[PDB]
């Protein structure tokens, strides 16, 4: 059970998925002293400044090639 972590989107890496439906983005944790910045895959239209709510924050998306 990982705490609900809020993370703001710092930049948009670009589209991904079989049909190009997901968006790979870089997120930075909001309430974090170290400012954990990781890469995530997002469903739906996302832009810079959007705050995502990760149910679990340990997972990391494979960087786009």
């Amino acid at each position: 059970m990982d705490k609900l972590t809020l993370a703001r989107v710092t930049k948009v890496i670009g589209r991904t998925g079989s049909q190009g439906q997901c968006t790979q983005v870089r997120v930075e944790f909001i309430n974090d002293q170290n400012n954990r910045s990781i890469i995530r895959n997002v469903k739906g239209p996302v832009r810079e400044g959007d705050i995502l709510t990760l149910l679990e924050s340990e997972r990391e998306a494979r960087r786009l090639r």
Partner: protein, 185 residues
Amino acid sequence: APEVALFGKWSLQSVNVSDISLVDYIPVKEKSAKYLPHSAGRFQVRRFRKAACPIVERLANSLMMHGRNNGKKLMTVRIVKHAFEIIYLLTGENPVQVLVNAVINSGPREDSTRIRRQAVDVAPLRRVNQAIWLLCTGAREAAFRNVKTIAECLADELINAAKGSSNSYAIKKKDELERVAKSNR
């Protein structure tokens, strides 16, 4: 400047969005404080223009589905009006606040994609979009071949969704997606 009240009855300035992520995607107050949820505007010229549409107008827009009811925005606005009256008369608080809480609680926070599936996060805009879609879909199903009117069904769906109770259609579907997504981690 006079305070703008939806339908001239409900105040908008006393509405707050709990979800920080959805604060800027649920337009209620300030520039979005509109007397009627029927404003003939262009919210699809660019990508995120729909994010500026008032949330009540989005509800009215999504309630006019199943082509039988396609284009009847006046009927849909009346339906939302009566549903809001029922909401206030049944719960006690601002029906706009009830709708906002339902939208906050009805949007999934993790979903699945075909990249077997892969669990992914949900952008705030899609989280709001699905919230409205699930709520309207729940009301529509409950009122089909049922004595309960659409306004009564809509009122019940919003109330249960706002409370988070697992009797609303939207909450059940929201939990279904998250549970399935949690498997595809």
